[PDB]
Design an enzyme around this catalytic site. Structure first.
Site, short mmCIF file in Angstrom:
data_model
loop_
_atom_site.label_atom_id
_atom_site.label_comp_id
_atom_site.label_asym_id
_atom_site.label_seq_id
_atom_site.Cartn_x
_atom_site.Cartn_y
_atom_site.Cartn_z
N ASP A 23 81.54 10.43 -47.01
CA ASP A 23 82.06 9.69 -45.85
C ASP A 23 83.59 9.15 -45.44
O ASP A 23 84.45 9.15 -46.26
CB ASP A 23 81.32 8.23 -46.11
CG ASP A 23 80.02 8.40 -46.56
OD1 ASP A 23 79.60 9.49 -47.17
OD2 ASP A 23 79.24 7.49 -46.10
N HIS A 42 84.03 7.55 -42.04
CA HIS A 42 83.57 6.21 -41.26
C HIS A 42 84.76 5.81 -40.50
O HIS A 42 85.31 4.63 -40.46
CB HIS A 42 83.29 5.22 -42.14
CG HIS A 42 81.72 5.16 -42.73
ND1 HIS A 42 80.71 5.25 -41.66
CD2 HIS A 42 81.27 5.38 -43.89
CE1 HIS A 42 79.40 5.32 -42.35
NE2 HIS A 42 79.76 5.38 -43.66
N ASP A 83 78.58 11.19 -41.99
CA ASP A 83 79.21 9.65 -41.71
C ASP A 83 80.51 9.59 -41.50
O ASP A 83 81.30 9.19 -42.22
CB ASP A 83 78.85 8.76 -43.15
CG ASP A 83 77.52 8.47 -43.19
OD1 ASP A 83 76.73 8.93 -42.45
OD2 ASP A 83 76.95 7.44 -43.93
N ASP A 122 81.16 5.32 -37.10
CA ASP A 122 80.53 3.88 -37.32
C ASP A 122 81.58 3.25 -38.57
O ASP A 122 82.21 3.82 -39.32
CB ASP A 122 79.21 3.89 -37.73
CG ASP A 122 78.28 4.15 -36.68
OD1 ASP A 122 78.47 3.81 -35.47
OD2 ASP A 122 77.16 4.52 -37.09
N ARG A 123 81.41 1.94 -38.39
CA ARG A 123 82.10 1.07 -39.22
C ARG A 123 83.42 0.81 -39.04
O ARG A 123 84.25 -0.06 -38.81
CB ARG A 123 81.92 1.38 -40.92
CG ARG A 123 80.27 1.67 -41.30
CD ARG A 123 79.53 0.11 -41.38
NE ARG A 123 78.16 0.24 -42.07
CZ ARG A 123 77.56 -0.75 -42.16
NH1 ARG A 123 77.87 -2.08 -41.70
NH2 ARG A 123 76.18 -0.41 -43.00
N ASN A 160 73.64 10.15 -42.20
CA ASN A 160 72.77 9.06 -41.51
C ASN A 160 73.36 8.39 -40.20
O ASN A 160 72.51 8.07 -39.45
CB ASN A 160 72.03 8.12 -42.40
CG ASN A 160 73.01 7.29 -43.10
OD1 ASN A 160 74.22 7.67 -43.63
ND2 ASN A 160 72.71 5.86 -43.12
N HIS A 161 74.77 8.26 -40.05
CA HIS A 161 75.32 7.75 -39.17
C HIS A 161 75.48 8.41 -37.89
O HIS A 161 76.05 7.88 -36.65
CB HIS A 161 76.64 6.85 -39.56
CG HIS A 161 76.44 5.42 -40.13
ND1 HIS A 161 76.58 4.47 -39.59
CD2 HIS A 161 76.26 5.09 -41.43
CE1 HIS A 161 76.32 3.40 -40.07
NE2 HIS A 161 76.21 4.00 -41.52
N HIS A 169 74.14 14.99 -47.08
CA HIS A 169 74.63 13.69 -47.07
C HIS A 169 74.02 12.64 -47.87
O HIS A 169 74.70 11.93 -48.73
CB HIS A 169 74.46 13.07 -45.53
CG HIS A 169 75.34 11.60 -45.49
ND1 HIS A 169 76.66 11.45 -45.66
CD2 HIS A 169 74.62 10.33 -45.56
CE1 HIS A 169 76.83 10.25 -45.83
NE2 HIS A 169 75.66 9.59 -45.38
N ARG A 228 66.92 0.72 -49.31
CA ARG A 228 67.16 0.53 -47.78
C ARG A 228 66.24 0.51 -46.81
O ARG A 228 66.22 0.34 -45.64
CB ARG A 228 68.18 1.74 -47.26
CG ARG A 228 69.17 2.11 -48.26
CD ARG A 228 69.82 3.51 -47.88
NE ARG A 228 70.77 4.19 -48.79
CZ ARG A 228 72.08 4.01 -48.44
NH1 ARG A 228 72.65 3.69 -47.27
NH2 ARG A 228 73.11 4.45 -49.52
N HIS A 263 77.26 9.18 -49.17
CA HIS A 263 76.17 8.21 -48.81
C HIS A 263 76.31 6.85 -49.69
O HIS A 263 75.41 5.89 -49.16
CB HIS A 263 74.63 8.72 -48.59
CG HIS A 263 73.66 8.04 -48.02
ND1 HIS A 263 73.81 7.37 -46.83
CD2 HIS A 263 72.52 7.73 -48.56
CE1 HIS A 263 72.75 6.68 -46.61
NE2 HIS A 263 71.84 6.96 -47.47
MN LIG Z 1 78.41 6.01 -45.04
MN LIG Z 2 75.09 7.48 -45.31
#
Ligand SMILES: [Mn+2]
Ligand SMILES: [Mn+2]
Ligand SMILES: CN1CCN(C(=O)[C@H]2[C@@H](C(=O)O)[C@@H]3CC[C@H]2O3)CC1
Length: 320
Positions: free
Chosen positions: A71, A73, A100, A103-104, A132-133, A181, A229, A256
């Site tokens: 990730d 991000h 990923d 995002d964030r 997943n993002h 991921h 989750r 992840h």
């Molecule tokens: Mn992530």
């Molecule tokens: Mn993730």
């Protein structure tokens, strides 16, 4: 005056090494890529990605190497730091970024357009796997959709969504190392064949192999559990081992999850987590890592690194 003050420009619409160097510097200086160039990058990488299998199958010769990152991000200044620590991408310094990207963090546009640029420049040595993002529901909430709408327009965001749908879901190196991921599957018996068969150009289903690849997590105990989750499952070491044995694999690399040391070796070495976003969200204080692999020696070697300074934009500044 026309476009003299608008920054880096593609060369007859194509990415070059000098464009990528200009782009990274322009982004470092907090400037914006001209929307026409951003558009050309997205249309071209959509075409490249849409011709790939859902499972990218890569061969490394004995003395070739590759770097696997987790990730990122939108932590663009940490992304540049990876390249300063480990070298620019090239045909002899290939990279895999395991989802990923966005995002964030609040430099998600800069991360993703840099990654797409390098994908166009070195398409057989620069690999992007979906996280997943890289999905609509997550982008809507966690910053990327707001960031794109702020820097460009909703139409540019729609195009990003379409491009993300063509990102492959897993990569297998030399028939021995599988990278995805999230992780492995909520039922036993899944094989590489099933991954190849996923029609991936969609938003992920609420359950099933495409969901699991983006969303599952390892757990230390045998068996499976409902994911904490609310999506997919947690899978134990016996799940990993049965999957690897059936598919003639040695281990998986996934991401992840944040780890204080930047990585975790679990399931007796069969399930490795790599996470490449140091001091995640300016608050976690974690180290990050990336993995080095060699064709003749696919054992993961971990390189840790810490966060570098970035401009004063807060994480999630663009989120809901
Ligand atoms: Mn992530
Ligand atoms: Mn993730
Ligand atoms: C989101 O995304 C979160 C997780 C997933 O992935 C990991 C850990 C922090 C952040 O990355």
């Amino acid at each position: 005056i026309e476009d003299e003050y608008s920054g880096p420009k593609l060369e007859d619409g194509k990415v070059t090494i000098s464009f990528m160097k200009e782009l990274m510097q322009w982004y470092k200086d907090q400037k914006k890529l001209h929307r026409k160039c951003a558009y050309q990058i997205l249309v071209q990488v959509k075409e490249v990605l849409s011709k790939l299998s859902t499972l990218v199958e890569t061969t490394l010769k004995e003395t070739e190497k590759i770097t696997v990152c987790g990730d990122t991000h939108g932590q663009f200044y940490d992304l540049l730091n990876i390249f300063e620590l480990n070298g620019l991408p090239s045909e002899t310094n290939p990279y895999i970024f395991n989802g990923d990207f966005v995002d964030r963090g609040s430099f998600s546009v800069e991360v993703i357009l840099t990654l797409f640029g390098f994908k166009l420049l070195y398409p057989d040595h620069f690999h992007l796997l979906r996280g997943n993002h890289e999905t609509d529901n997550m982008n809507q909430i966690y910053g990327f959709e707001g960031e794109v709408k702020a820097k460009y327009t909703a139409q540019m965001y729609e195009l990003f969504s379409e491009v993300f749908e063509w990102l492959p879901l897993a990569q297998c190196i030399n028939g021995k190392v599988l990278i995805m991921h999230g992780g492995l599957f909520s039922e036993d018996g899944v094989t590489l064949d099933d991954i190849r068969k996923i029609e991936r150009n969609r938003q992920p289903p609420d359950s099933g192999p495409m969901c699991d690849l983006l969303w599952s997590d390892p757990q230390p105990q045998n068996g499976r559990s409902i994911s904490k989750r609310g999506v997919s499952c947690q899978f134990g070491p016996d799940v990993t081992k049965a999957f690897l044995e059936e598919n003639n694999l040695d281990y998986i690399i996934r991401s992840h999850e944040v780890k204080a040391e930047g990585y975790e070796v679990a399931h007796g070495g069969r399930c490795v987590t790599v996470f490449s976003a140091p001091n995640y969200c300016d608050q976690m204080g974690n180290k990050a890592s990336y993995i080095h692999l060699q064709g003749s020696d696919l054992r993961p070697q971990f390189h840790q690194f810490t966060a570098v300074p970035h401009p004063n934009v807060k994480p999630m500044a663009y989120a809901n």
